[PDB]
Amino acid sequence: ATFEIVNRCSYTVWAAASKGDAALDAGGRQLNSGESWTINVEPGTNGGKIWARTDCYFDDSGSGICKTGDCGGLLRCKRFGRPPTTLAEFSLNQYGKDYIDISNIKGFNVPMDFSPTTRGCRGVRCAADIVGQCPAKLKAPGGGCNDACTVFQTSEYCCTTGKCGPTEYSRFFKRLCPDAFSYVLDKPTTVTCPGSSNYRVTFCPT
């Protein structure tokens, strides 16, 4: 499957793509404002994610640090990033269907649109100003708006027992971005697309 990752933000981001135990394609790249990066994701990839990282410094070896979404200090991510990270999530070719969603379960850093470029399903977006409106206790100093599980590490926020409900914090994300997951047991906002669809992830869509 082809993903085109587009940075419409006014600032540089460092895109990342991983399935948690390996890079997808090159795993990461710098995207200046307006740049597009096209990756190939193997059919049948389960549990892939794409995100943006902000305020990164990397050396010639591709080693460094980012203020949001750092993936163990590497330009080319093999593992998932440190919250807060708005996530584009996908599982491809699962019994004939692709499944896509946006998630705020690991917080929010950059607004995102995640849309197919082929026919047969709708996209999803979270483009509200979550950082500007972020509750004081969830604001991340490096930028972004953390989820409550990351900040407080309770069973209720992290849904550790597999029973949890919505919270004051999850409802904040849900109010601003209804089409994104706000907590682990949120009513799913997953979209089902035809198997082998292609997609575009746009940072700062509006």
Swiss-Prot record:
One of its GO terms (cellular component) is cytoplasmic vesicle. InterPro entries: Osmotin/thaumatin-like_sf (IPR037176), Thaumatin (IPR001938), Thaumatin_CS (IPR017949). It is found in: Cytoplasmic vesicle. Pfam families: Thaumatin (PF00314). Keywords: Cytoplasmic vesicle, Disulfide bond, Signal, Taste-modifying protein. Disulfide bonds join C9-C204, C56-C66, C71-C77, C121-C193, C126-C177, C134-C145, C149-C158, C159-C164. Gene3D superfamilies: Thaumatin. CDD domains: TLP-P. It comes from the Eukaryota. Belongs to the thaumatin family. Taste-modifying protein; intensely sweet-tasting. It is 100000 times sweeter than sucrose on a molar basis. This is Thaumatin I. It comes from Thaumatococcus daniellii. The lineage of its organism: Eukaryota, Viridiplantae, Streptophyta, Embryophyta, Tracheophyta.
